[PDB]
Design a protein around this ligand. Sequence first.
Ligand SMILES: *C(=O)([N][N]C(=O)[C]([C][C]([C])[C])[N]C(=O)O[C]C1=[C][C]=[C][C]=[C]1)[N][N]C(=O)[C]([C][C]([C])[C])[N]C(=O)O[C]C1=[C][C]=[C][C]=[C]1
Length: 215
Amino acid sequence: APDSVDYRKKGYVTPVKNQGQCGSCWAFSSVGALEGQLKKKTGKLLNLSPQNLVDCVSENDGCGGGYMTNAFQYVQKNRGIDSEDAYPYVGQEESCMYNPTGKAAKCRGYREIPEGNEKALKRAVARVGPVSVAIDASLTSFQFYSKGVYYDESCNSDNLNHAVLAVGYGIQKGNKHWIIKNSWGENWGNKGYILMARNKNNACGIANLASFPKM
Ligand SMILES: *C(=O)([N][N]C(=O)[C]([C][C]([C])[C])[N]C(=O)O[C]C1=[C][C]=[C][C]=[C]1)[N][N]C(=O)[C]([C][C]([C])[C])[N]C(=O)O[C]C1=[C][C]=[C][C]=[C]1
């Protein structure tokens, strides 16, 4: 486990997407996680379908919200997930139309990080790859972030309200951080990314609800 790692540099990350006016962030987090592993396992990098999840995961609420663990279990039971091309994103709830022939991957379960354990989280990102996480993205300081390691005393570790993708970690000007991939488009934050404080008392609940798919 290095002191710094960026999976974008390793080609384990697809370009930044934009969920739009739909609470499908959980879907984008799941997908991002699957894409890392799929890349790690097969050597290819393609866009998996968040819409597949939105319409098909019955234990979740589509645009009204959901959990990544539910999304992972779905892919396992369904024995697959479609590629973005085979099931494009519409940003709206629709009936499940999973196309078996557009299948791009699947998974055989998932693994959760010990709640609140930033150490294990780092270990997971180092060992396995991009990890799905939930944070508190309610603060105005988060909405308008652009540079530097983000942090705010007002952040609530118990009000988890946004699922996001941990694609790395490092240290900038003395500050350890998490390299986070958002789904609000590229013109947001730093080209769609945000570096959030690491080892700063589990800032914004970064390690409270994290997991990764297993293939
Ligand atoms: C996430 O999507 N978080 N919400 C957003 O990011 C919002 C959604 C609103 C529709 C506005 N912003 C947005 O969509 O805008 C994009 C944008 C913003 C600014 C500039 C440009 C573009 N949805 N939240 C969840 O899914 C949560 C998180 C989960 C990981 C804990 N889950 C949830 O609400 O629970 C649902 C549930 C599931 C199963 C059983 C019971 C409940």
